[PDB]
mmCIF file of C-alpha atoms and ligand atoms in Angstrom:
data_model
loop_
_atom_site.group_PDB
_atom_site.id
_atom_site.type_symbol
_atom_site.label_atom_id
_atom_site.label_comp_id
_atom_site.label_asym_id
_atom_site.label_seq_id
_atom_site.Cartn_x
_atom_site.Cartn_y
_atom_site.Cartn_z
ATOM 1 C CA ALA A 1 116.697 84.592 91.689
ATOM 2 C CA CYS A 2 114.442 87.983 92.688
ATOM 3 C CA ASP A 3 117.069 91.173 92.199
ATOM 4 C CA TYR A 4 114.293 93.661 94.289
ATOM 5 C CA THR A 5 111.883 91.761 96.811
ATOM 6 C CA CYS A 6 109.020 94.419 97.839
ATOM 7 C CA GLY A 7 107.124 92.292 100.694
ATOM 8 C CA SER A 8 106.146 89.248 99.256
ATOM 9 C CA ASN A 9 106.349 90.270 95.070
ATOM 10 C CA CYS A 10 109.844 89.231 93.541
ATOM 11 C CA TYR A 11 110.722 90.962 90.702
ATOM 12 C CA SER A 12 114.095 90.309 87.776
ATOM 13 C CA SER A 13 115.940 93.086 86.531
ATOM 14 C CA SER A 14 114.215 92.755 83.277
ATOM 15 C CA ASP A 15 110.092 93.552 85.120
ATOM 16 C CA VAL A 16 112.125 96.992 86.275
ATOM 17 C CA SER A 17 113.990 97.889 83.398
ATOM 18 C CA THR A 18 110.114 97.246 81.683
ATOM 19 C CA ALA A 19 108.581 99.548 84.132
ATOM 20 C CA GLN A 20 110.718 102.354 84.249
ATOM 21 C CA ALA A 21 110.169 102.289 80.572
ATOM 22 C CA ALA A 22 107.292 103.004 80.745
ATOM 23 C CA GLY A 23 107.361 105.243 83.429
ATOM 24 C CA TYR A 24 109.680 107.471 81.483
ATOM 25 C CA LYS A 25 108.356 107.690 77.891
ATOM 26 C CA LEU A 26 105.287 109.020 79.842
ATOM 27 C CA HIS A 27 107.245 111.413 81.896
ATOM 28 C CA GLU A 28 109.515 112.953 78.555
ATOM 29 C CA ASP A 29 106.158 112.834 76.881
ATOM 30 C CA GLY A 30 104.935 115.209 79.965
ATOM 31 C CA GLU A 31 101.568 112.780 79.941
ATOM 32 C CA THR A 32 100.051 110.964 83.335
ATOM 33 C CA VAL A 33 97.621 108.148 84.123
ATOM 34 C CA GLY A 34 95.809 106.981 87.378
ATOM 35 C CA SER A 35 94.420 109.434 89.837
ATOM 36 C CA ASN A 36 97.619 109.981 91.036
ATOM 37 C CA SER A 37 98.691 111.008 88.512
ATOM 38 C CA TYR A 38 101.819 108.930 88.076
ATOM 39 C CA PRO A 39 104.773 109.449 87.490
ATOM 40 C CA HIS A 40 104.611 111.819 90.098
ATOM 41 C CA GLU A 41 107.629 113.732 91.294
ATOM 42 C CA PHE A 42 109.038 112.098 94.366
ATOM 43 C CA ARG A 43 109.968 114.471 96.932
ATOM 44 C CA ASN A 44 112.278 111.683 99.075
ATOM 45 C CA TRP A 45 111.233 112.826 102.387
ATOM 46 C CA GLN A 46 112.321 109.974 104.814
ATOM 47 C CA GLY A 47 115.725 111.000 102.865
ATOM 48 C CA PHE A 48 116.711 107.284 101.018
ATOM 49 C CA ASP A 49 119.782 107.148 100.632
ATOM 50 C CA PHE A 50 119.306 107.709 96.228
ATOM 51 C CA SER A 51 123.155 107.783 94.866
ATOM 52 C CA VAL A 52 122.173 109.014 91.092
ATOM 53 C CA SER A 53 120.844 112.575 91.079
ATOM 54 C CA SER A 54 117.399 114.175 91.889
ATOM 55 C CA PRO A 55 114.652 115.178 90.399
ATOM 56 C CA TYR A 56 113.033 111.669 90.981
ATOM 57 C CA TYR A 57 109.744 110.229 89.830
ATOM 58 C CA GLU A 58 106.960 107.710 91.763
ATOM 59 C CA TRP A 59 106.047 105.082 89.371
ATOM 60 C CA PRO A 60 104.307 101.952 89.650
ATOM 61 C CA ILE A 61 105.347 98.895 89.480
ATOM 62 C CA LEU A 62 103.364 95.617 89.213
ATOM 63 C CA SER A 63 103.515 92.266 90.086
ATOM 64 C CA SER A 64 102.050 90.909 87.215
ATOM 65 C CA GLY A 65 104.275 92.087 85.103
ATOM 66 C CA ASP A 66 102.285 94.315 83.325
ATOM 67 C CA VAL A 67 102.498 97.956 82.718
ATOM 68 C CA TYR A 68 101.082 100.259 84.753
ATOM 69 C CA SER A 69 98.823 102.066 82.499
ATOM 70 C CA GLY A 70 95.974 103.325 85.476
ATOM 71 C CA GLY A 71 94.378 100.981 87.374
ATOM 72 C CA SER A 72 95.237 100.053 91.328
ATOM 73 C CA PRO A 73 99.038 101.374 91.951
ATOM 74 C CA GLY A 74 99.366 98.755 94.506
ATOM 75 C CA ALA A 75 102.101 99.110 97.081
ATOM 76 C CA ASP A 76 105.124 99.194 94.670
ATOM 77 C CA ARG A 77 107.134 101.490 93.185
ATOM 78 C CA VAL A 78 110.204 102.218 91.103
ATOM 79 C CA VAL A 79 111.553 105.630 91.521
ATOM 80 C CA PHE A 80 113.599 107.368 88.500
ATOM 81 C CA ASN A 81 115.190 110.656 87.713
ATOM 82 C CA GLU A 82 115.084 112.933 84.787
ATOM 83 C CA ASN A 83 118.659 111.055 83.194
ATOM 84 C CA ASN A 84 116.119 107.857 83.015
ATOM 85 C CA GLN A 85 118.116 106.505 85.956
ATOM 86 C CA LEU A 86 117.003 103.950 88.486
ATOM 87 C CA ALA A 87 117.349 104.926 91.773
ATOM 88 C CA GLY A 88 115.891 102.729 93.468
ATOM 89 C CA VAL A 89 112.627 100.404 93.615
ATOM 90 C CA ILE A 90 109.608 100.819 97.180
ATOM 91 C CA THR A 91 107.126 99.573 98.483
ATOM 92 C CA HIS A 92 103.809 100.514 101.073
ATOM 93 C CA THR A 93 104.399 96.817 102.190
ATOM 94 C CA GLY A 94 105.298 96.802 105.570
ATOM 95 C CA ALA A 95 106.455 100.371 106.790
ATOM 96 C CA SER A 96 103.452 102.360 108.648
ATOM 97 C CA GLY A 97 101.513 105.356 107.959
ATOM 98 C CA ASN A 98 101.600 106.450 104.135
ATOM 99 C CA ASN A 99 106.172 106.102 104.670
ATOM 100 C CA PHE A 100 107.897 104.018 102.102
ATOM 101 C CA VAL A 101 110.559 101.552 102.988
ATOM 102 C CA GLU A 102 112.833 99.915 100.455
ATOM 103 C CA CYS A 103 112.510 95.961 99.056
ATOM 104 C CA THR A 104 115.860 94.011 99.295
HETATM 105 N N1 LIG B 201 104.706 108.975 100.716
HETATM 106 C C1 LIG B 201 105.431 110.479 100.363
HETATM 107 N N2 LIG B 201 104.609 110.464 99.421
HETATM 108 C C2 LIG B 201 105.043 111.737 98.196
HETATM 109 C C3 LIG B 201 106.720 111.832 98.491
HETATM 110 N N3 LIG B 201 107.024 112.530 97.271
HETATM 111 C C4 LIG B 201 105.687 112.562 97.096
HETATM 112 N N4 LIG B 201 104.757 112.090 97.151
HETATM 113 C C5 LIG B 201 103.054 112.454 96.706
HETATM 114 O O1 LIG B 201 103.326 113.381 96.096
HETATM 115 C C6 LIG B 201 102.471 114.602 96.079
HETATM 116 C C7 LIG B 201 103.694 115.981 95.694
HETATM 117 O O2 LIG B 201 105.027 115.853 96.910
HETATM 118 C C8 LIG B 201 102.351 114.106 98.042
HETATM 119 O O3 LIG B 201 101.487 115.230 98.204
HETATM 120 C C9 LIG B 201 102.325 112.869 97.722
HETATM 121 O O4 LIG B 201 100.780 112.640 97.874
HETATM 122 P P1 LIG B 201 100.025 111.337 97.875
HETATM 123 O O5 LIG B 201 100.144 110.476 99.297
HETATM 124 O O6 LIG B 201 99.289 111.343 97.448
HETATM 125 O O7 LIG B 201 101.177 110.382 97.159
HETATM 126 C C10 LIG B 201 107.157 110.810 99.365
HETATM 127 O O8 LIG B 201 108.638 111.175 99.751
HETATM 128 N N5 LIG B 201 106.722 109.817 100.260
HETATM 129 CA CA1 LIG B 202 101.596 107.870 96.548
#
């Protein structure tokens, strides 16, 4: 069980796909939701080793299973590129400061 584990949140590949589709849709229409304007470009400061090509975009994936629509983001995120490919799943949980750690 769990294709991705961010902290204690367990996500299946289906949860990730759904979250990605919603994030990508907004990106291609040029729209954003939430105070931090999601989805927004992800600069990958930490140099995560994503295999897919940049640019990258940060989009919240909620543990409640709902698609993000502007409320509180939480700590988990799906990163995808303009080719609509999954770059990876990361979280703020377990990281210090304003950094991320990859979900296992
Ligand atoms: N932690 C972090 N924030 C990022 C990254 N890429 C983009 N951001 C967010 O997007 C802005 C533009 O690069 C940054 O100031 C940062 O704002 P936040 O800390 O407000 O999320 C990244 O790799 N790591
Ligand atoms: Ca952020």
